[PDB]
């Protein structure tokens, strides 16, 4: 009956309430404690909903639709749930009045169909008009970096961010291809950009002062087995009773390891990397041959080495082929932060890069690293899609405006339903002002003043509270996000309103 | 005697110093230390100030006693 | 679950009750606590890092104090109790603004702008160390550990431990980067002996009994050979399960070091050649062996040469006190890249208290070299920063006008806490420090927790690092923001 429908309304509001403070770059962050007892803090709606694992069917629908928003698009996972859940509150008083939810869901199909048509009209394709090649991507990075602690140092940060995208093919871009390694301690403005891949360098064992940071053309080869002979698991027991035989029964094992020398020595690989920690056995002979070795390397950073110089992983040292080797242009190692950092530079075949970040504390860089990810998506989608729309409240207000005029010509219950859907579009700009500190009541009244003057581009300024146009604020958003957000929010809402009774079997 | 009081476990470790260093008058140390707590309890509840100031007064009084 | 109503009120009360535990332990007069380990050992110390690390609790707000305190020991180490008390002051002042309708992010952003303006105020009133004199800088290093150790029995021998930290930091830290590595500082101590036998060693200790007693206690020069060469082998030296003697003399390795043990008849071959062997060595101890002596790890006897092998002064055995372990000393005589802290004591608790106090003493030396400009602490820095922000609050209009007033009143918590922990009227003392810095002249006069001759610590040459105090106020604002930025609490159950 209608009792379970009302219970599904509050279930969507409870999930929406957690994602309200996380909307926007200046929004608040949520703290969720996983069963693994690991602290996870993120403002992105995808990761938030994936860690909740809610048993409620309607609340899980908002979680499942967030994965579809992150798959086909990857941006707007927080706003798609807030918009989908807002329809549950607007349709709550309509159920008590006798209006069925089926006519409410029917009005959304006609409202979204007319809204998508208005998105293409607001999207203007511009590339070389009033813009250059270098200054195009630089002005987009300063938008997401505004109202942040890095705003003073953002001059040096944009130059390193643009070079990360240009270092890869503009046809295929991925945010996972750009790596970031946090460096505790040091000045923020002293960070540099690296063309190759780097790792954390957790190797604490001795044999330092050699393998200098200056290399010419080192050869890279992947390693599988362990170089050390120490057996961690198995063992053996053999004992003799002869007194004079105690001499040589302590002696010879490592001579068997010499069998793997000539195979590796004739290869000439100057870089030794593996997914297992390198032992304490030989740190020297490699340095005599100008061969470098680094142990305790994570498995995630080993896959980037294969895509860099074109290496390969072989189990033994016998069948290793000579053409699997690769070399970089230059090597660099920095001791800043009381820790050595190994990084490769000048790899022409590298499909990945690494950007180092420095700061006062580790928690300070965590806010800088995540604030950069929002700027990378704006720079990445600029070259991929040439159709962009004005964001920051601009597009969200006009989509709700056109539905008010078109509803006047429509007769029946669909008039108040489209007007309710248009009113439901005001939750997106609301939380953006409340999370940024601005009063949502005063802006909502003042923004609708110039919004009726015939200009559809008026947005909301995120720096200083005021009404105006985001065109001067350099706030750009792609058209694929606004189109897929209305379809994903409506489809997820139609499935919840179409289920009157919830049945859960235990077993 | 097993003592569940975490404050009483410290007194046991303190009394072991007198046995190892000398080993005479171990009981007299605990009796005299218990009387110091009786006077210190009346000084706190009537003050509620950190006892470290009162501790400094014991060092000046112990020098005159020696 | 609480959002937008009882969340802001509960986070302030939860963080205040936890921070109120260590408020009484702040300063040299602060009171200790009795901690009980799960193994049955009782630990008593005045360091806030030990107390906060032993806390196991499910409260999501108090977990930020443990994660932040881990990075404070490496960077500074003195920001354990001070930052937590200062962070609680910003939360108490923010609670009154929530009821007045002030947005929480404006409170978070208000403390950031107030902290940046207060740093520039101390830049004008700070004084120079090296510009005053060279030997006055060393006098600060000698009395650096005296303040923290003045409340302990160690304060009698403190003059001996003062010269140990002066030469240890110069070797590990270069004037270019001016950084000290924690992994290069070997802290080792044992039970027994006294604190007067502690010596400053330029290299790894590596306690060894020299295996069979026939081996000599000293390493021969081997016909004027250069230094003493060592060999580190972690290979499982063992029988032949499913040549070398001729290549050993070519390299000239004097001693062999291994992670595991040896047989009795195995060391008899190297005994006639005067080549001692070392067994039973931990994995972490091998790090300081090659770095201090500039040695290497032998890949093999065939390809090993004499060029890159390290050379030290000598290796001899020196008994320490009445301990029957018969430890040894390995010296260098040349500047190394690492040092080894040697601490002894007659009690297990005295050793643990002396090792942690030396850790904070080594970080102060790094801060004095990295930043020559310093300010006078002990309550004088917080009062000076209070009058600077409160005076500029009237010149700055808008919402940030009240954010500067609450930030100035929050800085007064530390000198009042030091006044409460000193057994004096916190309000009556705070009004005195503000009156001396205005009508008379601008100076630094702090609250004395320990009994001294008079006020004006500048006469007593009591100095604190400015960058050390600057790192504390930055972590306090960073911690206060992360608390206000979390309006929700979500936790699962226990099955």
UniProtKB/Swiss-Prot annotation, chain A:
GO molecular function: ATP binding; ATP hydrolysis activity; ATP-dependent protein folding chaperone; unfolded protein binding
InterPro entries named among the record's database cross-references: Chap_CCT_eta, Chaperone_TCP-1, Chaperonin_TCP-1_CS, Cpn60/GroEL/TCP-1, GroEL-like_apical_dom_sf, GROEL-like_equatorial_sf, TCP-1-like_intermed_sf, TCP-1_chaperonin
Localisation per UniProt entry: Cytoplasm
Record Pfam families: Cpn60_TCP1
Biological process annotations from GO: chaperone mediated protein folding independent of cofactor; protein folding
Main location: cytoplasm
Key words, A-Z: ATP-binding, Chaperone, Cytoplasm, Nucleotide-binding
Any one GO CC term of the record: chaperonin-containing T-complex
Assigned protein family: Belongs to the TCP-1 chaperonin family.
Subunit structure: Heterooligomeric complex of about 850 to 900 kDa that forms two stacked rings, 12 to 16 nm in diameter.
Function: Molecular chaperone; assists the folding of proteins upon ATP hydrolysis. Known to play a role, in vitro, in the folding of actin and tubulin. In yeast may play a role in mitotic spindle formation.
Name of the featured protein: T-complex protein 1 subunit eta
Swiss-Prot record, chain B:
Compartments where found: Cytoplasm
Family note: Belongs to the TCP-1 chaperonin family.
Free-text function comment from the UniProt entry: Molecular chaperone; assists the folding of proteins upon ATP hydrolysis. Known to play a role, in vitro, in the folding of actin and tubulin. In yeast may play a role in mitotic spindle formation.
Subunit structure: Heterooligomeric complex of about 850 to 900 kDa that forms two stacked rings, 12 to 16 nm in diameter. Interacts with PLP2; this interaction leads to inhibition of CCT complex mediated actin folding.
Protein name: T-complex protein 1 subunit beta
Taxonomic path: Eukaryota, Fungi, Dikarya, Ascomycota, Saccharomycotina
Swiss-Prot record, chain C:
Gene Ontology CC annotations of this record: chaperonin-containing T-complex
Signal peptide limits: none
GO process terms (BP): chaperone mediated protein folding independent of cofactor; protein folding
Family: Belongs to the TCP-1 chaperonin family.
Quaternary state and interactors: Heterooligomeric complex of about 850 to 900 kDa that forms two stacked rings, 12 to 16 nm in diameter.
Function according to Swiss-Prot or TrEMBL: Molecular chaperone; assists the folding of proteins upon ATP hydrolysis. Known to play a role, in vitro, in the folding of actin and tubulin. In yeast may play a role in mitotic spindle formation.
Protein name per Swiss-Prot or TrEMBL: T-complex protein 1 subunit epsilon
Organism in which the protein naturally occurs: Saccharomyces cerevisiae (strain ATCC 204508 / S288c)
């Amino acid at each position: 009956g209608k009792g379970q429908i009302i219970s599904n309304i509050n279930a969507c509001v409870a999930v929406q309430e957690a994602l309200k403070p996380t909307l926007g770059p200046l929004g608040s962050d949520i703290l969720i404690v996983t069963s693994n007892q690991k602290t996870t803090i993120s403002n992105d709606g995808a990761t938030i909903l994936k860690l909740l694992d809610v048993v409620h069917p309607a609340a899980k629908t908002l979680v499942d639709i967030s994965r579809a928003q992150d798959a086909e698009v990857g941006d707007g996972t927080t706003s798609v749930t807030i918009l989908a859940g807002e329809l549950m509150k607007e349709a709550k008083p309509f159920l008590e009045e006798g209006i069925s939810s089926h006519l409410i869901m029917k009005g959304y199909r006609k409202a979204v169909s007319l809204a998508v048509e208005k998105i293409n009209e607001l999207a203007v394709d511009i590339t070389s008009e009033k813009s250059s090649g270098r200054e195009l991507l630089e002005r987009c990075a300063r938008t997401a970096m505004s109202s942040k602690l890095i705003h003073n140092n953002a001059d040096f940060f944009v130059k390193m961010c643009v070079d990360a995208v240009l270092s890869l093919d503009r046809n295929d871009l991925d945010d996972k291809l750009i790596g970031i390694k946090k460096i505790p301690g040091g000045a923020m403005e002293e960070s540099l950009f690296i063309n190759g891949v780097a790792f954390k360098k957790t190797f604490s064992y001795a044999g330092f002062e050699q393998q200098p940071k200056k290399f010419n053309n080192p050869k890279i080869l992947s390693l599988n087995v362990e170089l050390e002979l120490k057996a961690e698991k198995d063992n053996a027991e053999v004992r003799v009773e002869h007194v004079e035989d105690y001499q040589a029964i302590v002696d010879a094992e490592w001579q068997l390891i010499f069998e793997k020398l000539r195979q590796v020595e004739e290869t000439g690989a100057n870089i030794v990397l593996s997914k297992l920690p390198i032992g304490d056995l030989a740190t020297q002979f490699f340095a005599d041959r100008n061969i470098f070795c680094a142990g305790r390397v994570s498995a995630d950073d080993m896959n980037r080495v294969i895509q860099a110089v074109g290496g390969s992983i072989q189990s033994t040292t016998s069948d290793i082929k000579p053409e699997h080797l690769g070399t970089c242009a230059l090597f660099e190692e920095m001791q800043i932060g009381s820790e050595r950092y190994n990084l490769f530079q000048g790899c022409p075949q590298a499909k990945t890069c690494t950007l180092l970040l420095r700061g006062g504390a580790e928690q300070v860089i965590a806010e800088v690293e995540r604030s950069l990810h929002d700027a990378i998506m704006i720079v990445k989608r600029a070259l991929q899609n040439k159709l962009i729309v004005a964001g920051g409240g601009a597009t969200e207000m006009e989509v709700s405006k056109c539905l008010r005029d078109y509803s006047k010509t429509i007769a029946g219950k669909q008039q108040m339903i489209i007007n309710a859907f248009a009113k439901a579009l005001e939750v997106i700009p609301r939380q953006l002002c409340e999370n940024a500190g601005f009063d949502a009541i005063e802006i909502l009244n003042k923004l609708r003043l110039a919004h009726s003057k015939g200009e559809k581009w008026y947005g909301v300024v995120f720096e200083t509270e005021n009404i105006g146009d985001n065109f001067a604020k350099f706030v750009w958003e792609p058209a694929l996000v606004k189109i897929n957000a209305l379809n994903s929010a409506t489809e997820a809402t139609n499935l919840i309103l179409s289920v009157d009774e919830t049945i859960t079997n235990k077993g | 005697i097993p003592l569940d009081n975490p404050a009483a476990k410290v007194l046991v470790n303190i009394s072991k110093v007198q046995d190892d260093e000398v080993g005479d008058g171990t009981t007299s140390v605990t009796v005299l230390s218990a009387e110091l707590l009786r006077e210190a309890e009346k000084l706190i509840d009537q003050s509620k100030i950190h006892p470290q100031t009162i501790i400094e007064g014991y060092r000046l009084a112990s020098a005159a006693a020696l | 679950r609480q959002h937008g109503l009882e969340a802001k009120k509960s986070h302030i009360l939860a963080a205040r009750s936890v921070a109120s535990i260590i408020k009484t332990s702040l300063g040299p007069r602060g009171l200790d606590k009795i901690l009980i380990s799960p193994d049955g050992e009782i630990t008593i110390t005045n360091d806030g890092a030990t107390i906060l690390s032993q806390m196991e609790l499910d409260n999501e707000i108090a977990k930020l104090l443990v994660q932040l305190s881990k990075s404070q020991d490496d960077e500074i180490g003195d920001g354990t109790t001070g930052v937590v008390v200062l962070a609680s002051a910003l939360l108490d002042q923010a609670l009154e603004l929530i009821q007045k309708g002030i947005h929480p992010i404006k409170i978070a952003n208000g403390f950031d702008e107030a902290a940046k303006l207060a740093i520039s105020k101390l830049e004008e009133t700070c004084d120079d160390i090296s510009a005053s004199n060279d030997e006055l800088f060393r006098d600060f290093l000698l009395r650096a550990a005296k303040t923290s150790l003045g409340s302990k029995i160690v304060s009698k021998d403190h003059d001996r431990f003062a010269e140990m930290a002066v030469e240890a930091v110069i070797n590990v830290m270069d004037k270019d980067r001016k950084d000290v590595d924690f992994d290069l500082i070997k802290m080792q101590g044992r039970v027994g002996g006294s604190i007067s036998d502690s010596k400053l060693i330029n290299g790894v200790i590596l306690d060894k009994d020299f295996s069979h007693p026939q081996m000599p206690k000293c390493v021969l020069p081997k016909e004027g050979s250069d230094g003493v060469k060592l060999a580190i082998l972690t290979c499982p030296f063992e029988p032949p399960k499913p040549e070398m003697i001729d290549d050993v003399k070519k390299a000239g390795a004097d001693v062999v070091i291994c992670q595991w043990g040896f047989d009795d008849e195995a060391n008899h071959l190297l005994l006639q050649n005067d080549l001692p062997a070392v067994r039973w060595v931990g994995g972490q101890e091998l790090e300081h062996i090659a770095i201090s002596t500039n040695g290497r790890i032998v890949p093999r006897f065939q390809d090993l040469s004499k060029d890159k092998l390290g050379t030290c002064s000598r290796i001899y055995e020196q008994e320490f006190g009445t301990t029957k372990d018969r430890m040894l000393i390995i010296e260098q005589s040349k500047e190394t890249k690492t040092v080894t802290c040697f601490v002894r004591g007659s009690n297990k608790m005295i050793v643990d208290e002396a090792e942690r106090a030396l850790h904070d003493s080594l970080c102060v030396v790094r801060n004095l070299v990295k930043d020559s400009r310093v300010v006078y602490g002990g309550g004088a820095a917080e009062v000076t920063m209070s009058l600077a922000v409160s005076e500029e609050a009237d010149k700055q209009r808008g919402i940030d006008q009240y954010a500067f007033r609450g930030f100035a009143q929050a800085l007064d918590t530390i000198p009042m806490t030091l006044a409460e922990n000193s057994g004096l009227d916190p309000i009556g003392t705070l009004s005195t420090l503000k009156s001396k810095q205005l009508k008379e002249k601008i100076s630094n006069i702090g609250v004395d927790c320990l009994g001294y001759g008079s006020n004006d610590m500048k006469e007593l040459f009591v100095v604190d690092p400015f960058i050390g105090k600057k790192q504390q106020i930055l972590l306090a604002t960073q911690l206060c923001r992360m608390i206000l930025k979390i309006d929700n609490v979500i936790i699962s159950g226990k099955d």
